[PDB]
Amino acid sequence: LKITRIDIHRTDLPVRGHSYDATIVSIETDTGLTGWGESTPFGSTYIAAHAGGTRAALELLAPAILGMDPRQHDRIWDRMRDTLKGHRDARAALDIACWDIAAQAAGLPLCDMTGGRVAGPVPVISSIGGDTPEAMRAKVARHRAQGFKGHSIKIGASEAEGGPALDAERITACLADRQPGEWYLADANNGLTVEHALRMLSLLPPGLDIVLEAPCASWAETKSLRARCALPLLLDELIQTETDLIAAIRDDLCDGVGLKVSKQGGITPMLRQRAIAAAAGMVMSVQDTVGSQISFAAILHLAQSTPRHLLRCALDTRAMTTAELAEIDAPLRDGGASAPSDPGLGLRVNRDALGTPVKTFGD
Amino acid sequence: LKITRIDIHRTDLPVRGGVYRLSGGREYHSYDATIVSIETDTGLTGWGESTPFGSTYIAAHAGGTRAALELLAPAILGMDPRQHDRIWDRMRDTLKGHRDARAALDIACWDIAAQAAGLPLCDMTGGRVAGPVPVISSIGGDTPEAMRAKVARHRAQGFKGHSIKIGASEAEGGPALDAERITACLADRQPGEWYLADANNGLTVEHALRMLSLLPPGLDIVLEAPCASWAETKSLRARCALPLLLDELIQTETDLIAAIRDDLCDGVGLKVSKQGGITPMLRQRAIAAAAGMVMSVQDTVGSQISFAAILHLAQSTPRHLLRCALDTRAMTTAELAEIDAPLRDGGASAPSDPGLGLRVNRDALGTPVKTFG
Amino acid sequence: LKITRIDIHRTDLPVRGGVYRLSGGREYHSYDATIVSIETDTGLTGWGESTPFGSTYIAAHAGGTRAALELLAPAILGMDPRQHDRIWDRMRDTLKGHRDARAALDIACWDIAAQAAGLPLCDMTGGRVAGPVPVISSIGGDTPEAMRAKVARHRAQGFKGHSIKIGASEAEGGPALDAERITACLADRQPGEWYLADANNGLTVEHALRMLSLLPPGLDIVLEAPCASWAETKSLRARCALPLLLDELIQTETDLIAAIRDDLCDGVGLKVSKQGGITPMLRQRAIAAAAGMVMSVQDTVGSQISFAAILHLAQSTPRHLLRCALDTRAMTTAELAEIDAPLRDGGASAPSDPGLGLRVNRDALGTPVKTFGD
Amino acid sequence: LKITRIDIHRTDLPVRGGVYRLSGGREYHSYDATIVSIETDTGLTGWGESTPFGSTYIAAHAGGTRAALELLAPAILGMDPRQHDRIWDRMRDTLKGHRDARAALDIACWDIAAQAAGLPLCDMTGGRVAGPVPVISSIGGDTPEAMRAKVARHRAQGFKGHSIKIGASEAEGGPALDAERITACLADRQPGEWYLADANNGLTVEHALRMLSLLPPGLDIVLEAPCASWAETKSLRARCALPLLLDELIQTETDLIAAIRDDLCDGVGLKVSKQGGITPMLRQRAIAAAAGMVMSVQDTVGSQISFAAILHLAQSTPRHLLRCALDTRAMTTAELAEIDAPLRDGGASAPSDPGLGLRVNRDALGTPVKTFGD
Ligand SMILES: [Mg+2]
Ligand SMILES: [Mg+2]
Incomplete structure (x- = not known):
């Protein structure tokens, strides 16, 4: 070959x-x-x-x-x-x-070449864009009605916009109507100062079930917050290489990782990084930056072979763009999707x- | 000899x-x-x-x-x-x-x-500590109301401690179910009782932290065996204010030394057959006692024969460090031996007969x- | 399927x-x-x-x-x-x-x-890395002179790596004897060789520190498995400048994470049946490689069947991290299977037959x- | 009962x-x-x-x-x-x-x-370990040449382990003298010997570091009780590659726990009456053994009665962790009791009589x- x-x-x-x-x-x-x-x-x-x-x-x-x-x-x-x-x-x-x-x-389907299909559909993440607390809350409600269980909620307000108080209110609002078996991730996209994150943490009401993702722009900032944050922390932007994960373990820096196919560099490093994270007991959201059905195929097959107790949803990139570059038999049903059984990625590319x-x- | x-x-x-359940879908x-x-x-x-x-x-x-x-x-x-x-x-x-x-x-x-x-074994392992030893229940996994009712039954029998088995999958309701299990199990609490929330090495750090965040303030609970590995447990330890007891991770004497070096825990689940019998139970007791770690004296499970070893060891353990003895008679219907150690005056008292005090059937x-x- | x-x-x-000797009076x-x-x-x-x-x-x-x-x-x-x-x-x-x-x-x-x-297993596990895998000798406990001579036999046979067993009791001569054993085994070294001093988890920290003090300056030596427990090994690590490789203490993937967290070692002895087969060998290789830990690819002991697994895994391991494969055929007399992988031109090469390449008797x-x- | x-x-x-001098002008x-x-x-x-x-x-x-x-x-x-x-x-x-x-x-x-x-006490404290217990030779503070000669005298009598006293004031020659003493005592080294430099909590960290720098490379030596306080000992530990044994600073079981937590030492001087009797000697042995700490089994000083307790405990101590027992009978002319445990060839064995085996006068x-x- x-x-x-x-x-x-x-x-x-x-x-x-x-x-x-x-x-x-x-x-x-x-x-x-x-x-x-x-x-x-x-x-x-x-x-x-x-x-x-x-x-x-x-x-x-x-x-x-x-x-x-x-x-x-x-x-x-x-x-x-x-x-x-x-x-x-x-x-x-x-x-x-x-x-x-x-x-x-x-x-073999890729999911069966990368460890084997874990039973049942993969939970798909709902994405909640930055907006007013009440607007985000309604979007969460709309997505809830469609069967989505996991939500990625965007935070990162400038002082002018309302700062830490606004982000705290956005989080409380999104969680306000929550039902059993739901999961929430506040994604700051590497955009908060440590001062902003600490004030935000202080402003949150007690008793919230929330994971904080990508709080700060740099490793040193993230390490400072880590020392004074009781919330589980997921790293995204800061984790690209296998060595990045080793550094995170060494520094006891996080409890989860946002693994994105094209950020980590394809199936090969997704598998290496899954092995490292799994060994460390880190939960993993399996996504990509953005893409068509082709990107979605890689996401889905990898998500499908990930241990379910570590998995924290997959991203359905088809929801992000209007592109129709390929067919794949993996319909979004009840907030979830299943990797197809065709050999390979299961794509029919146009x-x-x-x-x-x-x-x-x-x- | x-x-x-x-x-x-x-x-x-x-x-x-009824079926005994642990975290991760384990049934016995x-x-x-x-x-x-x-x-x-x-x-x-x-x-x-x-x-x-x-x-x-x-x-x-x-x-x-x-x-x-x-x-x-x-x-x-x-x-x-x-x-x-x-x-x-x-x-x-x-x-x-x-x-x-x-x-x-x-x-x-x-x-x-x-x-x-x-001599009875308790008088060969340091000497009888006065008064009965408080006994602890083993509350297998179920709904919050099912678990709370099991706690009540053990309460009526004279049990003072309760080990409550937690560790829910995301599908089952995750950290919120576990927090609900804990609150339900503590709801009817009477004075001088003691509770262990035992995850049997079954939580991710993420799940544990979420669970910790969900718990109402002002609870008197000890967390047991939260995570599957040494490194996960250390990570949780850095961000957990509750007292922590380790069980599965403590098997050898060297395990306890590593725990002390890492300041990993405030107590230890010492199980006769996990530690490897009387000899290592005594060695590990000496280490734990010197470190000020509380000790739940148990076994994995067993008959009256297991119970005699547990009881005699608990009976010679300093009371201020002891956190109950496991009464395994409540865990199985087997009748492999008689022991004169009934539940009365606040718990169970080691017999005065030489040896373990068993009449083996x-x-x-x-x-x-x-x-x- | x-x-x-x-x-x-x-x-x-x-x-x-002959009789095989490890530390603490262990004979086999x-x-x-x-x-x-x-x-x-x-x-x-x-x-x-x-x-x-x-x-x-x-x-x-x-x-x-x-x-x-x-x-x-x-x-x-x-x-x-x-x-x-x-x-x-x-x-x-x-x-x-x-x-x-x-x-x-x-x-x-x-x-x-x-x-x-x-596919041959080496091609299913990442792909064949070019050239033969260097093989490691297994130099059992003896007097320094006898050890040195055993190093020679293996050297002449095309061995570049040597695992030298150490761990003398005080009665036997303690750290001084172990230091002498090390200096003697390195005495005749030729360019391109590599030495591991394997204590098989058998030294006290006091013994290890004494031994380290007794070693002459300027040696190229890796210390393997110095102590019986994690806590002891951590204590030695704080006061040891030599590269440390862990063996017995690394069995699970979580063990390796703990070693990284504690910055405990610079290498790992990966033994197929200790880690639990091909699956965990691959997981633990991914973790070790990401941390830049060197890896000696071995097994506890075995026939040609054990050797097949060792060799294919070693063959797909990046050569700059690899620190030899154990050839189990040198340790046993069993003829349980045929495999076409002889020692020649630098070590052994995994065969190209699909699977492990075994023909089982x-x-x-x-x-x-x-x-x-x- | x-x-x-x-x-x-x-x-x-x-x-x-030989009237003893400890560090800091102490006399007895x-x-x-x-x-x-x-x-x-x-x-x-x-x-x-x-x-x-x-x-x-x-x-x-x-x-x-x-x-x-x-x-x-x-x-x-x-x-x-x-x-x-x-x-x-x-x-x-x-x-x-x-x-x-x-x-x-x-x-x-x-x-x-x-x-x-x-049962003899060694059999009530775990069981007799086979063979005689090695007995430590004590080398009092003196000129390097005199100390060396005394080591040679004890060597000729069959002793293998030597405790050598250090801790010179600046006026007396400071760290240079202590280093010369150590160098001299090890100069006639024969295989299977052990050396403990005991400063009796007497050195400043500055003095200890200067002494360490002055020592020639390649010595097989253990440092005992370097400093007067926990905090000083911690500071030295951070910058000392020699195995460290604590004596004065370890009295309670909680002290050993603190030493483990701070990774402060590789051994302990257990003295029957410092630790508080057989009961705490046993607790502390269990802790130390689990930590892989070597143990010298001694007492402050005493008659045959003190020696009976020392010997029985040393006799039931695992031999790989044991670093000699002290024969207190050599320290005084007192004859308070008979015990059948003669010193021969640098070793002694606990008697078989029930109890301590004493016949008290x-x-x-x-x-x-x-x-x-x-
Ligand atoms: Mg993200
Ligand atoms: Mg001393």
């Missing part, structure tokens, strides 16, 4: 409800298998990544893995590392496509929907 | 009071007990029990106990049963770990030692499965 | 050469191996070995291994051998610990899965002590 | 050969001993000794030992001498600290308990200074 051709595509994913610049990769083998992978950074200020950067890195990564056996995930990973440091966003698309191929060649490839390597 | 014959018995102990319907008798040249007989709490509590199971005894029993034949440290050394030199197997032999030897000396044990000598 | 039948074999493994003369075959509905057979190193290396013994398998083997009947994590979970739900017993079943499932995928194992299923 | 009568005796023990010329006998209703008599090493070793003196016995002795009358923990509790409830006074009563109760059971003790009596 040999990689023979790699096609790099660029396509715009309009926001459901600006747009996202997606890079979609196909990899072909000498036996005639095709694997697919997606990497689409969430704008250019979520982490140190942007779409133009993803494509510029692929100029180096794609030619380097030509002729390799797509099943040898660690050696392909090493080849990518030896070619270009970091740029895990670019690694992700290639890595995912190789795993798609590998699972196809083994006659090649024409992607536009002519911006770049081709091989022949 | 010389050990001449060792007999290994196997029997089943049926659960008393009966318990597979291993009962050992040891004979001396002088014609004394000593008894010991080791009954793992199924195969899913710690790294031990009844088949493993018996497999370990195949090496341990022949190893100690010919030894003086009064020389507890040297017999222990012999067992260690023969087979690492397997404290479940050491336990039954170790207890039988102490039974012999005490009989030879004409051999007809309840079945024919031995293996004999050595 | 379904597991249909599991056979438990018990076979004796006679020692190769022969090995009690348990060998497991797993069959599928499709007619594939996978093989796995678990052979505790006597009964005092870790909390494991062959009788215990077999007793545990009485619970484990029937629990995995009917399962898909390819779903390693779900099979792992089933085993954990059945019996806590007893990774020795998990190991034989887990390895046989990986053997099957790699066969079904048409089925009459050499004896009639199964127990069978489950069909 | 009931305690019926307690007799308190006082007797002088004349120094034998004879030792004021307190000896207690306890009688039972069944006609058994047990014996116990407590003799503080002068009045400046730890917070104890002979006059204080006797003043405390005025409270402790009547408190334990009518008690069952076999219930060691409950007698201990009664003593603790009666008077805090004063473990020197507890020791004499406690040892006598264990003597009775052992005789009642018809009542005439050598004088009339009791106090009888209880209540």
